[PDB]
Design a protein around this ligand. Sequence first.
Ligand SMILES: *[C@@H]1O[C@H](CO)[C@@H](O[C@@H]2O[C@H](CO)[C@@H](O[C@@H]3O[C@H](CO[C@H]4O[C@H](CO[C@H]5O[C@H](CO)[C@@H](O)[C@H](O)[C@@H]5O)[C@@H](O)[C@H](O[C@H]5O[C@H](CO)[C@@H](O)[C@H](O)[C@@H]5O)[C@@H]4O)[C@@H](O)[C@H](O[C@H]4O[C@H](CO)[C@@H](O)[C@H](O)[C@@H]4O[C@H]4O[C@H](CO)[C@@H](O)[C@H](O)[C@@H]4O)[C@@H]3O)[C@H](O)[C@H]2NC(C)=O)[C@H](O)[C@H]1NC(C)=O
Ligand SMILES: *[C@@H]1O[C@H](CO)[C@@H](O[C@@H]2O[C@H](CO)[C@@H](O)[C@H](O)[C@H]2NC(C)=O)[C@H](O)[C@H]1NC(C)=O
Lengths: 51, 132, 107
Amino acid sequence: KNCSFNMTTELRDKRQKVYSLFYRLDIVPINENQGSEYRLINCNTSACTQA
Amino acid sequence: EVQLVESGGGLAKPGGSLRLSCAASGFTFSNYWMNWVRQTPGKGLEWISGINSGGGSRSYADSVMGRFIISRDNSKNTLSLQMNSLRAEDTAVYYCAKVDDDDYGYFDTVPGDLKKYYLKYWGRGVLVTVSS
Amino acid sequence: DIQMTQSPSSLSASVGDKVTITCQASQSISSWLAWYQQKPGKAPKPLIYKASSLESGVPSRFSGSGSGTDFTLTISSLQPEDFATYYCQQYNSAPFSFGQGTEVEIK
Ligand SMILES: *[C@@H]1O[C@H](CO)[C@@H](O[C@@H]2O[C@H](CO)[C@@H](O[C@@H]3O[C@H](CO[C@H]4O[C@H](CO[C@H]5O[C@H](CO)[C@@H](O)[C@H](O)[C@@H]5O)[C@@H](O)[C@H](O[C@H]5O[C@H](CO)[C@@H](O)[C@H](O)[C@@H]5O)[C@@H]4O)[C@@H](O)[C@H](O[C@H]4O[C@H](CO)[C@@H](O)[C@H](O)[C@@H]4O[C@H]4O[C@H](CO)[C@@H](O)[C@H](O)[C@@H]4O)[C@@H]3O)[C@H](O)[C@H]2NC(C)=O)[C@H](O)[C@H]1NC(C)=O
Ligand SMILES: *[C@@H]1O[C@H](CO)[C@@H](O[C@@H]2O[C@H](CO)[C@@H](O)[C@H](O)[C@H]2NC(C)=O)[C@H](O)[C@H]1NC(C)=O
């Protein structure tokens, strides 16, 4: 899935819009009504640590 | 290739109302800003409105501030511009244009701000005129 | 607000002759200025996006330069299919003012 989302940067007073591919198994819908508005599966239980 | 066309324009009366529409295809309409410009007969062109990819932070020119309202629908991949209290001087071939670079990248508050743009692709403008 | 000035208003040409359209700016805009042309009955098209960068698809013949208020376009009329208005539009400003347009044709 070619996902796009807003993100922060080094400058706390500025933000950026990026995109990246994500496997369907690593994404879960938020409301199941719009089709978009996807969320990372682990977001509602803990924050994963990047290896 | 990118295909952009607009319709809805036509004969209207002074002080009335009208609505313009612009359809897009061949590209991600939800990742490109849209601006409206007019080409009056004889003299040069002129920019009159602009909207971001998200549909907010609508900008207009002093000559159409408060009369023309811009709007877009990312779901339908279309753009619109509501006309209210139009006058005789507002006769022109309103052109539907799209910016060159997408809104991806750094930004201050609006996703596409902080980046410079220029009207790259232009649609087949529609003429609008009003007379007694 | 900021407004542009384009010159010459109109001029004659031929095939092979080099014409140069140049436009001035009241305020400094560094290099954020694009050039355009429009055939009769056709929508405007882009030719130069930056003050000195060429647009994809257009022939390598076209060129032009300038910075600050001064800017210029470089033509050699090697073709008979460039005879129409050549607009000078600046950006990096709220109004995005356009130029008065310049018409060029064969004698
Ligand atoms: C990164 O960050 C940036 C910044 O945070 C994010 O940008 C923002 O992203 C969000 C989410 O995508 C966008 O939200 C959407 O905005 C559109 C457009 O909103 C403008 O137009 C509204 C319509 O205006 C009416 O009235 C005028 C006259 O006044 C008329 O000319 C118009 O024709 C309309 O009749 C207007 O209502 C909005 O402002 C008002 O409401 C907002 C809150 O909504 C207030 O804050 C304002 O003060 C003001 O009161 C605004 O001007 C909305 O249309 C979207 O909502 C629709 O879509 C939703 C999703 O489907 C749906 O839930 C809503 O009910 C609503 O539904 C309508 O549209 C659907 C889609 O076409 C239809 O299916 C439906 O039937 C219905 O027609 C939504 O709010 C932001 O606009 C955008 N930009 C800004 C500046 O915030 C960016 O997204 C982030 N990026 C990422 C990837 O995260
Ligand atoms: C966090 O989100 C997950 C995913 O939505 C929730 O778990 C799912 O909840 C739905 C609710 O209808 C169940 O049908 C699924 O079987 C659940 N698991 C999976 C793997 O999808 C979870 O309950 C949420 N909350 C917590 C605290 O985990």
